Structures are given as structure tokens and as C-alpha cells.
Design a binder for this molecule. Sequence first.
Ligand code: ADE
Length: 458
Amino acid sequence: GSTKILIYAFNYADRMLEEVPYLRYSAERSLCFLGDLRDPGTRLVVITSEAVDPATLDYHLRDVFRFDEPALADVRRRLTLLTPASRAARPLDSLVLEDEALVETLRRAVAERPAGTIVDFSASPATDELGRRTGATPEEGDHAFVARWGSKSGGKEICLRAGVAVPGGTSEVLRSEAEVVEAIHRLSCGTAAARRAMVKLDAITWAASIGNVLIDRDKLRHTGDLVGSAEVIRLPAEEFRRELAEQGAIVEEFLEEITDSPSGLGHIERDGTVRVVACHDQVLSGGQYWGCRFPADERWRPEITDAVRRTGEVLSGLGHRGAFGVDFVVAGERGLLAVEINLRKVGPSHVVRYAEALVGARVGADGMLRGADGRPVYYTHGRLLEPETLGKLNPRTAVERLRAEGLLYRHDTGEGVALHVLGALNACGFVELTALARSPEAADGYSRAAQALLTGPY
Ligand SMILES: Nc1ncnc2[nH]cnc12
């Protein structure tokens, strides 16, 4: 007997939730986990800031996970969908916590079963609290540890230990502007049209590209002040300063010529067993990761895998259980350098789950997914937001459109298109789409077709 409780709240996004609006519908991502209901024992609870739409659920059941009609009723019986009483735009976990009754219910559910697991994006105070107060152990909670080691500096240190190539820099916090300046002027330079330095605020709260601040050294050498020579600062200066004071930053060289930005995804079992889950080729694309592709490029896939494994081992030693992410850059002829470490699930993870479900099989060998017949599988995954055109659709409508023009993934052919986060369609005009084909080009084409279908009238 298992009980699993799904709260895929984006907690590390304190600002973005109040900006990018389709975020409230983020939790829907968790619907990739329904595969678990294949075990007669597993019981799932889904929590979203906004109610999952019956249509979406139906799609997932039939056209995604391909449940046989006999068992389907049973599967449905072992699934519950719940919404916090708060409809304020805040991290989902927090909202859940605030609803005492909901928490109580969750606890009761957990008790009812042998085993409790909480399924989350990043480990957070709120998630930890929930775990404590419900008797479910977060699958990816461990807040203090995360704080310690998912930080920029910590990540860098881990990378170094692993023997994974990092960009030239220290792994040392810089609690003052002077320190930062010193760090900047003590670097690797290297021939660069516009030689640059980058200061990355150490906290994990600042994940991705809000913390990272970039200064061209020329400007500095003339004017002593950090925020006088900032070529890219996305923080209110004052706030940045405060962060520096209180949490600080770490100093890394800005690699100029970037061709690809691959990603590596790792899982530690509780017995330390590290698994290379997958490798993709993310495309920062303004950092909003408007998507990604699988598998990674043939050249650096194998290389990446080994690196990931090493990192995983290191993390296990350190004592991290759950899931880790390594973000990379490819720097002209200089090669491949690990830039980020993430102590949390990452975008690709959820996509990968869905992909696996579609295929019917797990990632495969040590790398590269393959269908029943053994033939390789390639997917393209994109976030698309078009208030204008998509805001006209509802989940059901979209699904039927996909079915009509034979765009929807069919299991008999082994190629097509599956959507995610369908609830955002009507409300924010947002959707994820993933496209699977026999060749990557084919997959891309399919994706394009889908886009065309959905972002036009009819
Ligand atoms: N050193 C670096 N140069 C350029 N972009 C980066 N993103 C993260 N680290 C970077």
C-alpha cells in the first residue's frame, strides 16, 4: 500500500508567480505521475491552485497513459483532486499549509496507508512542514540541505569535487562590493571582444537568471562601483546590494561564444543508488526555457552522461537523496562546462515522465529511449503562450483538434503530439506541447504542425 501526494508548487519563484500568470496552472505538470496508478496499491492525491479539468483528466487517462477500459474505473477510484481554499497567487505548498482542514485530510489519507511520499518540485519550508504534519516524507524535500548545497557556490564546489568542468571562478561568497570587485579583477580573461565578468547571487531563492548579474570589466576599471558598470542587472540596485550583504554572490567568467546549453538529470535512490535519468538540449531562450529537446546531441550526450553520474555519486556522498540537475554550456572550442547545480526536479523531468509513459518504456539502456520494436525515439517539447489565439480554446477542444488532423500521438504508429497543463489554455492562453517521432526532424515537424493547428482559427 502506497499513498503519494502531489504538490508541484514553484516555491522558489516568489516574484514570478505575481508576473508570469500561467504559473498558477503549473501544478498540472504533476499529471505525468498518473502512470504510478498502474501499481494496484498506489493511491494518488493531486493538488493544484486551480481545479484540474475533467476533460484534461480524461485525456491523461486514455490518450496519454492508455489505460485499458476494464481497469480504468479502479484507477479512477484511487485518485483524488483537491484545491486549497486560498485563490491568492502564492506558492501552492504555502496555500495548502494555510488550509488546516486540507492538511488534516492529507494526514488522514497518509495514515490510512502503509507509506507516505510527497511529490514536489523543490524542497521548501512549507513542503517540509507538510511532510512533518502529515507523516509523508517529501520525495524531494530536505530544506536545509538544499539551501546549503543547491546554492551557486555550493553547486560549483560539488562540480569541482566531481571533476566536472566549471567556468573559471572561486566557490566563495562575497559579502561586500569590494570583495566582488577583487574577485572580478583576478580572473582568467581570455581574448574577448568585450571581456566580461558575472556575479551570481549565492542564494537558491535567486535560482536562474534574476540573481546572475554581469559587469564588463572595462567600465569597472574606470568607475569603481559594481552597479555603475552593470551591463545586465535585473535586480533593483538596492535589493541586489542587500542580497550581496546578507547572502552574497560568487564570481564566474562570462563565456562568450555559446553554441548549445545541454542538461543532465539525476536521481539518487535512498540507498545511494545514482541513476542517469536523461540528457537533453535545453535552449535557455531568454531563460524562460520556452522548451527543450531529447536526446542530447550525439557528440556530448555520452560525455554528459558520465559527468552526471560522477556528480550524482558526489551528491550521494554528501547525502542528497532525490533528484539533481546539472546545467551546461558549450564554449566554442573550449568545450563543455557545468554552470549550474539544482537540488530539485527540473523542467525536463516532468516532460521525460510523460515521454516515457507515451513510449511505454523507461529511459533505456543508460542513454537514449527506444520503443517496443527497439527503434529510437525523439521528442520536442515547447512552452507556447498566445493569449490571442489559445485563449479561445478549452482542453477538450484542443484535444479534439489534435485528434482530427491526426496530430495526436497514437500508440500504434508510435509518433505524435501530447499536451500538458491544459487548464492554462482557456485562462492564460498557455500550453505545453510535446512531439514524438521516429526521427528528430520528424518530431520537430510534428510540433510545428501542432502549433499551426492550435494558433490559427478554424
Ligand atoms: N560563465 C557563464 N558564462 C555565460 N553564461 C553563463 N551562464 C551561467 N554561467 C555562465
